[PDB]
Amino acid sequence: FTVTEKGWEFVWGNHPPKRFWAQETAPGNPHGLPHEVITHYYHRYPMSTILGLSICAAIATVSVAASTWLFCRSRVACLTPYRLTPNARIPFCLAVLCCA
Amino acid sequence: YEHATTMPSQAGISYNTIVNRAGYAPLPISITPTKIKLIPTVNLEYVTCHYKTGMDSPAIKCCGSQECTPTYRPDEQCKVFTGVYPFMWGGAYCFCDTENTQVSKAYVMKSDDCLADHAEAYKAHTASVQAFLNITVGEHSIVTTVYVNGETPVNFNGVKITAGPLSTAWTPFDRKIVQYAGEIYNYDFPEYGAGQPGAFGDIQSRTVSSSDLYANTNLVLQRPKAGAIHVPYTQAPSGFEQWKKDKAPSLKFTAPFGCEIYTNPIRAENCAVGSIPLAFDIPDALFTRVSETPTLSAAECTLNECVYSSDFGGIATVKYSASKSGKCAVHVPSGTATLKEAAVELTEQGSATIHFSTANIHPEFRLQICTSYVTCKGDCHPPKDHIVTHPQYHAQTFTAAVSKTAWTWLTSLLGGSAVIIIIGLVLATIVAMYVLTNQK
Numbered sequence A: 001f002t003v004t005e006k007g008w009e010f011v012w013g014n015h016p017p018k019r020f021w022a023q024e025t026a027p028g029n030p031h032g033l034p035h036e037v038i039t040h041y042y043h044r045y046p047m048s049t050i051l052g053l054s055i056c057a058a059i060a061t062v063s064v065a066a067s068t069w070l071f072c073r074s075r076v077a078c079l080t081p082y083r084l085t086p087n088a089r090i091p092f093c094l095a096v097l098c099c100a
Numbered sequence B: 001y002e003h004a005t006t007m008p009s010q011a012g013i014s015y016n017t018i019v020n021r022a023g024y025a026p027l028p029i030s031i032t033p034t035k036i037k038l039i040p041t042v043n044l045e046y047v048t049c050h051y052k053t054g055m056d057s058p059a060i061k062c063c064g065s066q067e068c069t070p071t072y073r074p075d076e077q078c079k080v081f082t083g084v085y086p087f088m089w090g091g092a093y094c095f096c097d098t099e100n101t102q103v104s105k106a107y108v109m110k111s112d113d114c115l116a117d118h119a120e121a122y123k124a125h126t127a128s129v130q131a132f133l134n135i136t137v138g139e140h141s142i143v144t145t146v147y148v149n150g151e152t153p154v155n156f157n158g159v160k161i162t163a164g165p166l167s168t169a170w171t172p173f174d175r176k177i178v179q180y181a182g183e184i185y186n187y188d189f190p191e192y193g194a195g196q197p198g199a200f201g202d203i204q205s206r207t208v209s210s211s212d213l214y215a216n217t218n219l220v221l222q223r224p225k226a227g228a229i230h231v232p233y234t235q236a237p238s239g240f241e242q243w244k245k246d247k248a249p250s251l252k253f254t255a256p257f258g259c260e261i262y263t264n265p266i267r268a269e270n271c272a273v274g275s276i277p278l279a280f281d282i283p284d285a286l287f288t289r290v291s292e293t294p295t296l297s298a299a300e301c302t303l304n305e306c307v308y309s310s311d312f313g314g315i316a317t318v319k320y321s322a323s324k325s326g327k328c329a330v331h332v333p334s335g336t337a338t339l340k341e342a343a344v345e346l347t348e349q350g351s352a353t354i355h356f357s358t359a360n361i362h363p364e365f366r367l368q369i370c371t372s373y374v375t376c377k378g379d380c381h382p383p384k385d386h387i388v389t390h391p392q393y394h395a396q397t398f399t400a401a402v403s404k405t406a407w408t409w410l411t412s413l414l415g416g417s418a419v420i421i422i423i424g425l426v427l428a429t430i431v432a433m434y435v436l437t438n439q440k
């Protein structure tokens, strides 16, 4: 049977009822490696780690993709004025930031 | 002075609170509900027990005919069977081979054991609440059976306590209940005069000693066997005994919130639902001025041991240099920890130990003492026992169980991505400004 923090009681035959309450003793270690942390906070608080971890990963991926997109756009906008010069002289930008 | 507090209605768990005044020493109030009762008002609809089919001795008329007397007894039926030839131990009863009649008559009564083995069908409504509180205010301790209706005060030593009303109107008993053998069942019994054969309430009496009886058992008379003196009959089997065969577990086994169902009177005890609002009117006599009470100075809190277990799994040691000996209403205004002791003895100089229960892996709270507000921090560890036999004394906060490592990881994932976005935005703005200024 599953016993939660709310409680759980059973009566076995003519014995008096016995009540039990759970405690937070999940497998894993929160003060450890990421896999142990995920195991501890998934055995505890389920559907609060799967949702939270997925949201965090999605936000991180969106942030990384957006940062890459702005960096590429900035590189294009800083190089094309110098890039499409017929003789293609680009000393200054490469010297100040090494974009290429 | 007036106070309005609210405490959980969990029996057997003490609840501590502190009262603070602008120019008076803080005072501790401890309330311990030993037993919380819920007593609905019940009306005895009727009483049902095993029935007994009583048959009058057959009226045998030799060489003649009889008539059916009018029906007056419960479920009573009378029938005249013609062409009978009864026999007795002496011999043939009638001398006519035919045209003899036998009147058979049957009815239903309560069993002889209805005074003891009977089930009472009640209608339950209008639940009331009663709390047996140990109340300790101003080092004054009493026990009271306070009614949790909002209207009624309880008075002691000039203090007025107005408990109630209960937060939740939920009750385990439904509208129609059945009492049998000291157990309560939620049964939708038929109304009086509406019982059905072979089911509960097939015979109904208003009271265990009542002179009335409604019977409905499909009693029908059969033809007597040839050469026999008896009254055959056919009935649906007793509805009471069938109900006992298919009772289902009582309310003491199927009630929510851990309620314990009792009888005489019909009560539900120790239901872990709702909250009791308490209204306190405390006279100023118990209050003591700040000068009278000891004043704390140079106090430091150390968590020499902490496990976030259900019970008081933490000890805090506070080093104090007080002005004088006395009593301190030690309390944590925050919900991080729950204190076993609502008051602590205080000396001129030394260390005081306080037992507290917390659900936080990394606790940090503001322990309030006579006047000081010490900041106590530390680390707690998971307990040994997977399962215990007592409810949790503390309370669980949303961020209670998040460790420092988890916090750092979350900040790196959420807080480092924002840094990368800011860096990209700054780079884009710089590039745009540079190219725009270099056009002209």
Ligand SMILES: *[C@@H]1O[C@H](CO)[C@@H](O)[C@H](O)[C@H]1NC(C)=O
Binding pocket: B032, B034, B134, B143
């Ligand atoms: C409450 O008061 C009763 C009556 O003195 C006592 O028996 C009981 O132990 C008290 N409960 C607690 C928790 O002290």
